[PDB]
Amino acid sequence: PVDVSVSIFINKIYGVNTLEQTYKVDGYIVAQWTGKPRKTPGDKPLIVENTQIERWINNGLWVPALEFINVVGSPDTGNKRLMLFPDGRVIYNARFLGSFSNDMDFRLFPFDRQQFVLELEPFSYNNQQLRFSDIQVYTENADNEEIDEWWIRGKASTHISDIRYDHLSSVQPNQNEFSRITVRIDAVRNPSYYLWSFILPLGLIIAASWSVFWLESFSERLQTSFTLMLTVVAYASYTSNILPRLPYTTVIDQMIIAGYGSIFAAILLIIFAHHRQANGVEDDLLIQRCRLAFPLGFLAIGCVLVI
Amino acid sequence: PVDVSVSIFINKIYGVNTLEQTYKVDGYIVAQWTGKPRKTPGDKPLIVENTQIERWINNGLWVPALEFINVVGSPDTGNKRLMLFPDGRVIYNARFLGSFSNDMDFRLFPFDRQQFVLELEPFSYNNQQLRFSDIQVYTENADNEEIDEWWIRGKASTHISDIRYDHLSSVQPNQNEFSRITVRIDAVRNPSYYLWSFILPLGLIIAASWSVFWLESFSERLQTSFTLMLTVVAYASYTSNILPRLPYTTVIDQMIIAGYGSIFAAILLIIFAHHRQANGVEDDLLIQRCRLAFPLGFLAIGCVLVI
Amino acid sequence: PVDVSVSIFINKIYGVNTLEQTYKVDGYIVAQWTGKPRKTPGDKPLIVENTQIERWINNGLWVPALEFINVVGSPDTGNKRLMLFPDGRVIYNARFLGSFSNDMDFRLFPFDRQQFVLELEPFSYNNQQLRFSDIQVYTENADNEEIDEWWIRGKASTHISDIRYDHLSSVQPNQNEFSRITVRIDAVRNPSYYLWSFILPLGLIIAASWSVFWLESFSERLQTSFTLMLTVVAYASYTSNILPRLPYTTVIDQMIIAGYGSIFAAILLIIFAHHRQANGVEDDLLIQRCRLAFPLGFLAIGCVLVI
Amino acid sequence: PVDVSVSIFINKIYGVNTLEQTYKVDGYIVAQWTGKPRKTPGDKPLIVENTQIERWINNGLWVPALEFINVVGSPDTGNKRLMLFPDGRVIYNARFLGSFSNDMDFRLFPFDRQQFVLELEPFSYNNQQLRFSDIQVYTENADNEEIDEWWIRGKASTHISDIRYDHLSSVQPNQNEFSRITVRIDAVRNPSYYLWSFILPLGLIIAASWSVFWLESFSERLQTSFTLMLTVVAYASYTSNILPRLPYTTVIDQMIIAGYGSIFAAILLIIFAHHRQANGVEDDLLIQRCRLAFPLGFLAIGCVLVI
Amino acid sequence: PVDVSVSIFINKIYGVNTLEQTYKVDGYIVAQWTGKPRKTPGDKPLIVENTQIERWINNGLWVPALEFINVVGSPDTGNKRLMLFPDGRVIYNARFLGSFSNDMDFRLFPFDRQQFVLELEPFSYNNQQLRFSDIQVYTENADNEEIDEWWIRGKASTHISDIRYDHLSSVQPNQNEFSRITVRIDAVRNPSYYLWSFILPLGLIIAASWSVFWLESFSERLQTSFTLMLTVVAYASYTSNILPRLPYTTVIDQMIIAGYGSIFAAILLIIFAHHRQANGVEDDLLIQRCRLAFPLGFLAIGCVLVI
Ligand SMILES: C[C@]12C[C@]3(C)C[C@](N)(C1)C[C@](Br)(C2)C3
Ligand SMILES: C[C@]12C[C@]3(C)C[C@](N)(C1)C[C@](Br)(C2)C3
Ligand SMILES: C[C@]12C[C@]3(C)C[C@](N)(C1)C[C@](Br)(C2)C3
Ligand SMILES: C[C@]12C[C@]3(C)C[C@](N)(C1)C[C@](Br)(C2)C3
Ligand SMILES: C[C@]12C[C@]3(C)C[C@](N)(C1)C[C@](Br)(C2)C3
Ligand SMILES: C[C@]12C[C@]3(C)C[C@](N)(C1)C[C@](Br)(C2)C3
């Protein structure tokens, strides 16, 4: 039962793909285990680079495949290194870049909380043969958060476990349990850009929408309100070409609907003001004086929806 | 006639390409068959990973090529494992990610119902040489319907068959028969997002389309409807740049056609109302008060395209 | 002069790239020719898949390179199979996916008819050496044209010809003639979507444009047509996001020009009626009574461009 | 000093990447030189394709690396062929699809004409070791420019020179001059589509912009001009989605600005016209019929950027 | 401690990826060092290109792997050359295309200054085995900034330093030592297109925004003002569709915000003016005379917001 030490160096976590629920992660893996001693020039340890490694395995070297469970496709592997010690122990080293998968709820975008996840598990050897002794995760990052899209807030998670499969092969006595390394990183979205350039002008759209009411005439009140729709729709497209594609509504997505409603409500009100009467033009001078009523009556719908 | 057991592990199904009638699938194939009994180190089964598999094949290990029939181009194959047993049987283990094809009808979008399909068939060995014994597909799926894009309803459907090829080699008697595994997953689209954010606002527009009829003046009636047609056009672009690429109209696309018609029909009435006569300035007192005549007339006809 | 029979299996034709004049084709090549008698294992044929084919060539099996003339870059080659017969003949089988080139006129879009073409020609052996005996191409044809972007209508033509190069290397006597396979597939674009979501609404825009003439005031007539000019710009971009990139005008693109033109023509008429004059007020009430005139002529000028 | 004859067969030039300044080229390289007399099967020439070439080199065949100086990344290598003659001479043949770099001016878009360039230069051998004897470039060209994106009008140019590198290896004797083949192909952009679907309508817009002055009222005159501001802005977005992203203004980019200016200048006139006064109402009695001044006044200025 | 020469020939820097903090670099690397004296063919140096290098390493040749630390994924490598001189020295030569990462602030867009960084560091050899002796960087770049995306200003800075990694595999004395080459290249963005086609028209809108107060009536003063909101929105989409996507505000977007803001305050005034009163209609004849009041108050903030 080989105790295998692992260490993951996270260099960059970037390129989150919103629809696929996918992100890319650059780094190095370091795997070590103690086999039993080998002969070698002097009393040195050896360095074995890239192409010369399989030359070593062809002569019967056991170098186990350690698989990234949650990666999408095969990872781009840079330089690889075998360090063979005289006492027996063996360092495997490789740089990697791969696209990883994980469940990502974006409903409350751009205020979403997500976590970048790594899961490592040997491909061919169960826990009785190859199991992970201990694991360090080195995230060489700090400061300059206000420039990055994602703010790592935690440091790094680490969890060695045993996973068993009950539906198998049909070798069963104990080829059921593989030891699995899982790395988690909590990160928060930098909401700044969407706040000041998307949320903020939207509010100004909706507010100024309501000021259709301090128009004097009815025709003005109604006609103008159409120009306002033309406006929200226009604001929809500007939002939509640009915001990341999803299969469910975000916060902003709703705000737009809220825009549409605010108004459709205003259209009905404007017609009602005019046509609830005892003559014809009995404008409910207080319902037309929903001048400061309904802008706040819109806040009732907004903060109830916070609950 | 070699009996080969197969097992498919579906890991992620994502990236539906609507035009290419294409979807991406991450998973594993497992193939096992009984060979001639061998001598392994000790007496334990012997494990052979990646690079040395080719070495084993080159010295004569029969590993049949199993081709995915409906894959587009050759797929990203991860790790390969040969597990060689002393009793004879051989266990093939390999991870894959591929683009797969199937006829996919999207006309009833976003209410479309689909089935994701896999087809596996040996490349060079017919049914009299290589035969598919049995097939289980392990689809590690459940829950979160609500939140992500596709709702699986099936579990894993299956049909092992013999395929007859009419036009061949220079082979004669019965070697036109290949055994093929076909794996099916029935699935439904989560229409929530398109319902609330696309269908709903369109309705408010078409609702507002009709609100031109509560305008008082004639000049007011026609100028207004032009801004209103401009508005539906504005909505089309917002819609189209976002919606999936297709070669036919969706349900949504029709709603848009219905929008234009609504307005264009409204234009005809308004002009018709004004210049048909019996003095000169004959406002048809009833026809203009069709204010909620055909808006329900859209609700009647809309609920007519039903079937 | 080795006689080589070939067969092409057309699996999918997709992804027409209009500017590159490029489309994708998935399939198989089957090359068969008769070699010198070999003594095989047992007496039935020996099959060589993928990896092992390369080692057979190194020890001197002649497997001629067959290149796709009209492919863009090298094709994604799938499984490879060498089937070696005892009477001598050898059958090569390989799966491929590649992007192909051909002259593709898209002017009559969305009614363009194309032909997807495969041209096969030996790389190193001219017809004195390697000759194409015959070729059938099996298209996986039938039904569901209405769900597909392209409607294949011919069942492909085929003609083996000999192609001669006047301009060569330092080879002399008659090594300037190569035998070439040409596969043509007649295909038409599915016009449904482009008709109903693009042509139809556009027609109504141009029509409703003309109803500017039923306005009573001059001021209205002119400030109005600016909204309409605003609409054709609007309709263009909506078409523009979507329609395939070209270096020439399409049919739709023409319709848009006439739209711009129709209103700019209206602007001139509207002003002409109004300010050339005997008066100030002398809109020739019959020249402005081109409300139903100018629509007849748009079909006259419209149906000539069919010329 | 090995004399090497080279010939390039140009198959297709496509995919101009405007921001990267790169275009892709399909074709073949043909290089020939004389080696030392060899023994061939019989006495006929020997053909060596792809896989077997690698092995000829291990046993000591001198195959010089000819590098594309101006390629971006390494090119897609198709089939390779060695034709080995008994007297010694050698013919190298390869298909390529490559990403090429060259300086490209787009300021005068869409009327730009460019020259596509290839530069070939040995990777390891100076001119005294390897010298380029001559180069023919065969561009299989003719006809239907009207369907293609680019109109090649030249017939391919040729330039062999010696290139000197001042700074070093540090093998010094003369190290420093490599023989370089430079190939140029002159081409013009097909302006047809950009003329009729962009230039023409922009003009009608700017033209109709001037139609604001034949309005009788001031409010009509000023309010309307806002719509034209919206129209030019609308036309801006419509243009920008389609046009090539660049780091400088094109002819069209300016033509748009000319629109903005024509309208913005009109605004100042219209404002100036009404309120700088001797009464309240002092529209300068002849300045409001600046309806025919400013349009030709835009044309004099338009004909000014001659320069 | 092996003394190693390095030389970097940069022929292209392109493809700045704004969200990923990424840019591409094409060039060649040259590394040389002195080994133990060798027996070469004849006595002049032997050149080893591509394929034959693997053969040389198998005979026990030490060729060190030099890694680009700040690359994302592995570089696209072209031709490789070994220059083996008889006295011991060895010179490595290779083409590369790589995607590199560096901290990149884009807030001051389009007036940003950046620096492109290359970091070279041995993969397996610490400072007392392999040391970087010296480094020249050849920037074969010059002139014609007129036309390219970036303006190089420096001549690249260079700094070899010793990078020590804090913790280990357990050896303490001095094996935590790596020599690192850092190459810096200063560059500035060409603001020309973004100034003239984005900043300038934006300003005229904002200018013309203020143009609502020379309107006579209140209803028109207010009705028009909604059109300006729509126009600023319209300009947002046009800008955002084309501008590079980022996670923070640029200069231009701020201008857009100020655009929305300038309009919203004017909206407040137009209402403020009319209905604080002693009748209903006594328009503060002084506050719609704020016609050049706060355009300068906006320009004062424009002058001040630069500090
Ligand atoms: C038993 C396992 C199950 C798994 C899903 C993952 C693995 N690491 C262990 C490899 C396989 Br082939 C076999 C498939
Ligand atoms: C006979 C077959 C036909 C096929 C289309 C599919 C296959 N599995 C069996 C392989 C090929 Br090469 C030969 C092509
Ligand atoms: C003589 C030929 C000409 C060709 C265009 C096509 C081919 N099959 C025969 C190969 C090449 Br290298 C030589 C180029
Ligand atoms: C609503 C919009 C607004 C815009 C400025 C940009 C667009 N993408 C959406 C197209 C137009 Br025509 C309509 C003009
Ligand atoms: C001496 C040269 C200089 C060059 C820029 C181009 C080349 N063909 C000759 C290869 C290199 Br590595 C060496 C770099
Ligand atoms: C010890 C090192 C540390 C490093 C960050 C960089 C390197 N060149 C030396 C490779 C690794 Br894997 C190990 C990671």
Short mmCIF file of N, CA, C and O and ligand atoms in Angstrom, two decimals, chain A residues 9 28 30 81 93-94 140, chain E residues 67 69 121-124 165 178, ligand 6:
data_model
loop_
_atom_site.label_atom_id
_atom_site.label_comp_id
_atom_site.label_asym_id
_atom_site.label_seq_id
_atom_site.Cartn_x
_atom_site.Cartn_y
_atom_site.Cartn_z
N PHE A 9 0.50 23.25 -7.05
CA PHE A 9 0.86 24.66 -7.10
C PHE A 9 -0.08 25.39 -8.03
O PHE A 9 0.03 25.25 -9.24
N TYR A 28 1.29 23.32 -11.26
CA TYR A 28 2.16 22.14 -11.28
C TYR A 28 1.66 21.09 -10.30
O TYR A 28 1.15 21.45 -9.23
N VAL A 30 3.03 17.85 -7.92
CA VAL A 30 4.21 17.18 -7.41
C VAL A 30 3.75 15.92 -6.69
O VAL A 30 2.99 15.99 -5.74
N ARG A 81 9.18 15.95 -14.96
CA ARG A 81 10.44 15.65 -14.29
C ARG A 81 10.32 14.45 -13.37
O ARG A 81 9.42 14.37 -12.54
N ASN A 93 7.11 15.46 -11.34
CA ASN A 93 6.82 16.90 -11.45
C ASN A 93 6.32 17.28 -12.82
O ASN A 93 6.94 16.92 -13.82
N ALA A 94 5.20 17.98 -12.89
CA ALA A 94 4.67 18.39 -14.18
C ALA A 94 3.86 19.68 -14.09
O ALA A 94 3.11 19.88 -13.14
N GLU A 140 0.26 30.79 -4.77
CA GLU A 140 1.20 31.91 -4.69
C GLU A 140 0.58 33.25 -5.08
O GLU A 140 1.10 33.95 -5.95
N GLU E 67 12.27 26.56 -19.08
CA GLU E 67 10.84 26.83 -19.02
C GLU E 67 10.48 28.31 -18.96
O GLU E 67 11.07 29.08 -18.20
N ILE E 69 8.22 30.61 -17.34
CA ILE E 69 7.37 30.61 -16.15
C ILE E 69 6.01 31.25 -16.41
O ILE E 69 4.99 30.71 -15.99
N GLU E 121 13.30 30.31 -16.79
CA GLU E 121 13.83 29.65 -15.60
C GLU E 121 13.94 28.13 -15.81
O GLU E 121 12.98 27.48 -16.24
N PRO E 122 15.13 27.58 -15.52
CA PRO E 122 15.39 26.14 -15.62
C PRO E 122 14.37 25.32 -14.85
O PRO E 122 13.90 25.77 -13.79
N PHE E 123 14.01 24.15 -15.36
CA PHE E 123 12.93 23.37 -14.77
C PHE E 123 13.41 22.47 -13.65
O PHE E 123 12.69 22.22 -12.68
N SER E 124 14.64 21.98 -13.77
CA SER E 124 15.10 20.95 -12.85
C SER E 124 16.46 21.26 -12.27
O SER E 124 16.97 20.54 -11.41
N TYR E 165 12.85 29.63 -3.70
CA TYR E 165 11.55 29.15 -3.29
C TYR E 165 11.66 28.68 -1.85
O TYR E 165 12.54 27.90 -1.50
N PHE E 178 17.11 29.17 -7.77
CA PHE E 178 16.94 29.15 -9.22
C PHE E 178 17.29 30.47 -9.88
O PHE E 178 16.91 31.53 -9.40
C1 LIG F 6 11.36 23.91 -7.50
C2 LIG F 6 10.50 24.35 -8.64
C3 LIG F 6 9.59 25.44 -8.24
C4 LIG F 6 8.70 25.90 -9.37
C5 LIG F 6 7.82 27.03 -8.96
C6 LIG F 6 9.46 26.24 -10.62
C7 LIG F 6 10.39 25.14 -11.01
N1 LIG F 6 11.15 25.54 -12.17
C8 LIG F 6 11.32 24.71 -9.83
C9 LIG F 6 9.51 23.95 -11.30
C10 LIG F 6 8.72 23.59 -10.22
BR1 LIG F 6 7.49 22.13 -10.60
C11 LIG F 6 9.62 23.23 -9.06
C12 LIG F 6 7.87 24.70 -9.71
#
